[PDB]
Amino acid sequence: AGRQVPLLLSMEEDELALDKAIESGDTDLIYFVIHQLRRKLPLASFFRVVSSRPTASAMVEALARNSDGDGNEDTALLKDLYYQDDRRLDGASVFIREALQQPETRTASDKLDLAANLLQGNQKEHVFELGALKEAKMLLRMQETFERDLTDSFVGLSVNQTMFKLIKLGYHGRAKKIQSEFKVPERVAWWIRLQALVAKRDWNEIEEISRQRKSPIGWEPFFNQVLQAGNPRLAATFIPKCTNLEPGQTITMYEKCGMRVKAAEEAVRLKDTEAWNRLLEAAGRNTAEGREIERLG
Amino acid sequence: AGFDAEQVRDKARKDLLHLLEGVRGKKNLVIEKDLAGPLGVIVKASTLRDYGVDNFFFLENKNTGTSQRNIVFIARGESVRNAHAIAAQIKRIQRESQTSHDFHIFWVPRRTLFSDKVLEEAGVLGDANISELPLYFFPLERDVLSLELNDSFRDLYLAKDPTPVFLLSRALMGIQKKHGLFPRIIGKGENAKRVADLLSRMRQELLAGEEAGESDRAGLSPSTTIESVIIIDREVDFVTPLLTQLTYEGLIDEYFGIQNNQTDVDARKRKIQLDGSDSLYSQLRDANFAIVGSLLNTVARRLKSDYESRHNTKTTAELKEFVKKLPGYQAEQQSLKIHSNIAEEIINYTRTEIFNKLLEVQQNLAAGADPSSQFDSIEELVARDTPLPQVLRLLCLYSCISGGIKTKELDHFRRLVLQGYGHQHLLTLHNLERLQMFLSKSSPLASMITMSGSSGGPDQKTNYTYLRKQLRLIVDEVNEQDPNDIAYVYSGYAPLSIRLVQCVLQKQYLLSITGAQGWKGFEEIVKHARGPTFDEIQKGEDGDKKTVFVVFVGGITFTEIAALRFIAKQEEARRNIVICTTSIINGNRMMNAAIETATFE
């Protein structure tokens, strides 16, 4: 059963030899038969033989993407194989892959175009990928605009990453253009907006944000994010904007900002005499006035 | 007389050294980088130079030294990516040489027709001395054998390459030739069945050889040493590796990355050895991280209280005793200092908001909560730029545990990933679709198994809704300090894979928590897991405690290794359990099989 296979092929039993090699599991015999068939047959006929048998096509497909030791492809083989089998998603992925190796955006979009062009040969079911392809071509274009205007790197970043870089660099007008264009979700966009301003240290517009009523992600994120590596002063300003909170945590939040005074004040406001004690003993009836803590009851 | 993992290491070392003796003179070494690690488990670098090796080079590095006349190639012989690389290595110094060179290639484990053609169609087949180096299992522990194929998951489940299955089959057959036929081959899943098939084919080819004058001396009869081999296909249970592992070794693999019993930390950075030769690590590795503090404390104050031991003493001889126990009091000292440092780092890691937001999702998904209820939490994680592998594992978790994703939620998820991390990940999401780890609910391939909706679909998926109850996957009342059940490895969630194994080995215990072999008693229940259930008896044709081989086709996690060691302690009386695997797998390795890394920049 190990060279009982060439026996089958010596009598030019092509498709039958392949099947016995597949049953064997011996991947070596399968390559050997695949190699024989390729040298012997019209390529189109080879594809028909090899597409009837899942394991065979799979191995054919592997060798095509690894024929010097990683990297290099037999992209030509892949395209034709997928074309003669009407495997359009697999064919499109070959072109997408080609777009990721193109050094200029115009060429990269051309590959995406080739990629898309295959998918409109069956339209339905491929709606998402068509939309996705259409988006990247737009994003690449907008990013090439940004690079020339604003003189910084943008091409290749994700939608979200682009918003981030635009905001960190103070270009909120453009960053809002990306958002509106690609219909970025509210909660997503607010999370991005916050993280960028914090990276940017733009404490001024973080402040200007705080001047509206509600947040789709709450103000809890604004507290922690600003506190961490930032202004306890600015941080503290987000209590009591915080709707979604647990009992007596506004207190600990003032504490975490280093404001024992206002914590004590918040402690008294909540009718929690115990926390007020803990806060006064922390100072100590005399230190840090403490009297001021004491005067607050 | 029984199976000993030492015979595999000693044989491996023998067969390599024997080939090194064969190359008369001194050598330069060109080793496949993925194979360098696993080699380290069977021979020392020191030992390799005794046998005449100058410098070490990687096949992937192309910078093979010119200093020596004999250049030695060591790489896996099934790899096509290696053959093309070796031939191109020969002429890349055949034209820029100094002498002429005699080239040597040790194929692991065998010389293939593919090798002999790629080497011939490069003109260099006749200029190279080719021999076979039959390494299969790398004994990583006395109870853990591994083929160490790092792309075995990708190759098997994405590329549909049946090479992992073939190597795994020959390895197990090697155990049979030496110790007897597996009295029972017990399994679950397509690739588990394929291995059982090749074992059946290979058993018949050995009887066909002997009958037809190929001799081979002695026909194979059922083992007296071996009870059974149990084979589980990884694709039967994708949920376990997708989950964040919660054992000590498990968290090391998740955060630092374990490979060939070794990892990297920052005191470029330094290497830690992680095997069971260390006394302390043996008691730590399989323990839930929660009680690792306890375990470190207790051993720390048991060290200083055994330094309180007998240095009072003084005759002249009972101090010569105490002083010889002092190397080990330094080994045990520093063993503790290293792991007290790792634990400290891993603790900080497990305190972050993002870590806790991920675990929270997993815990809800794994408990049977409406997957939809986790959507906002996933949305945030994406927007907070948490590493793509960590998000994808959640996405696949949701898909695999629910019978796929609702169509609305799918498209939202697709948009987040693509917009979060890049449009390149069209390819990534496609690959996870091929892996059948991330699918729409309306796909035929998404459906879980029911006895209700009988027909329609042949590759119906594992029912986590059914098996959660029927195999008691949830034990949220489990002591981590003195664990009563395998669910401890996830702090309340027992891996389905090991539960499946428990259907064979611990039938009574399994009934207890809700004496025949095979699946008897759990036929219905196991029918609800993906793929073929089988129990092939080998009678051939012509007592004490026995060894059980529990085999994972497609990779095994440390948590699963842990849960198996747990069972092995329980069964210490009648059974010695040995674990076999194609490789040691985890959630991140799985996603890397899928993640496209090209980038549009």
UniProtKB/TrEMBL annotation, chain A:
At the top level, the lineage of the source is Eukaryota
Vps16 C-terminal domain mapped to chain residues: 1-286
Q: Which residues bind (R)-malate?
A: 86, 89, 126
* Coiled-coil intervals: none
What this protein is reported to do is described as: Essential for vacuolar protein sorting. Required for vacuole biogenesis, stability and to maintain vacuole morphology.
What the record says about family reads: Belongs to the VPS16 family.
Specify the protein name: Probable vacuolar protein sorting-associated protein 16 homolog
* Upper classification of the organism: Eukaryota, Fungi, Dikarya, Ascomycota, Pezizomycotina
Q: Which part of the complete sequence is present?
A: 532 to 810 of 816
TrEMBL record, chain B:
Q: Which residues form a coiled coil?
A: none
| GO biological process, any | vesicle-mediated transport
Gene Ontology molecular function terms on file: ligase activity
Alphabetically sorted, this entry's keywords are: Ligase
Q: What family is this protein classified in?
A: Belongs to the STXBP/unc-18/SEC1 family.
Q: What is this protein called?
A: Small conjugating protein ligase-like protein
According to its UniProt entry, this protein's organism is Chaetomium thermophilum (strain DSM 1495 / CBS 144.50 / IMI 039719)
Which stretch of the full-length chain is present here?
144 to 796 of 806
